[PDB]
């Protein structure tokens, strides 16, 4: 309710499903970590530019 | 004091003489004996009722809305007996008073007391409606000698800037009031409350009196102060920096 008018808005969630771990190919854990980091702030700053 | 009593029941003719009589006794006593008088008629409605009267046993042709073609001329010599005159000390001041049909503003009676006389006051319904005593609304009324009626000397120098400002003030609240209404709180700024807060303040404090509350000059102009205390100085436009280093802090 920015104004008399109401305008649709949405809201991040973490619903906390259990990431696929990566520990066979390399044991590439702590670069996948990162890259899941990365996407995971990417998503929350989308949901508010969305 | 003298008081000069007209009944309803008393018969229509003598309503028109008795402003004649209390016009003659006030000139007697400001121009024989030197003295200052403040004469007030009422509910001149009725005069103009009677003058209607007259004229149609006279059997004369009626003019617009009835009234006699030379009413305009009667209400002239009526009203003017006033002023100062020079080579006297004394004078007089006339306080009519007169009802309005219908609330019709444009009413022959007011429009012909409109080119005789000087400024306008008012009281408002709504202001009634809302327990505020006594209700005279401020906007709309005016005044052609404020000019110069008050000025430095003749009393402190912070009487007209104190008007406009408050004037000034009192306008934007009510507008600032209007917005509230039409957005909502949410919308408001910190100076949107200072606003609301001077408007019912004001509206709390100045326009209400009390019937018997007898506030001087010097008083009133201490309570504006009081009210416009609420805003910061530099919001405070209308004053002159020159009396806000002064006034403003105290």
Redesign the interface.
Known sequence: NV??VTLPVFEHYHEGTDSYELTGLARGGEQLAKLKRNYAKAVELLVELA | VCLFLNLANDPTIERIITPRLALTTAEFLAYQCEKHVLVILTDMSSYAEALREVSAAREEVPGRRGFPGYMYTDLATIYERAGRVEGRNGSITQIPILTMPNDDITHPIPDLTGYITEGQIYVDRQLHNRQIYPPINVLPSLSRLMKSAIGEGMTRKDHADVSNQLYACYAIGKDVQAMKAV??EE?LTSDDLLYLEFLQKFEKNFITQGPYENRTVYETLDIGWQLLRIFPKEMLKRIPQSTLSEFYPR
């Open positions: 104004a008399g | 957005v909502g919308a």
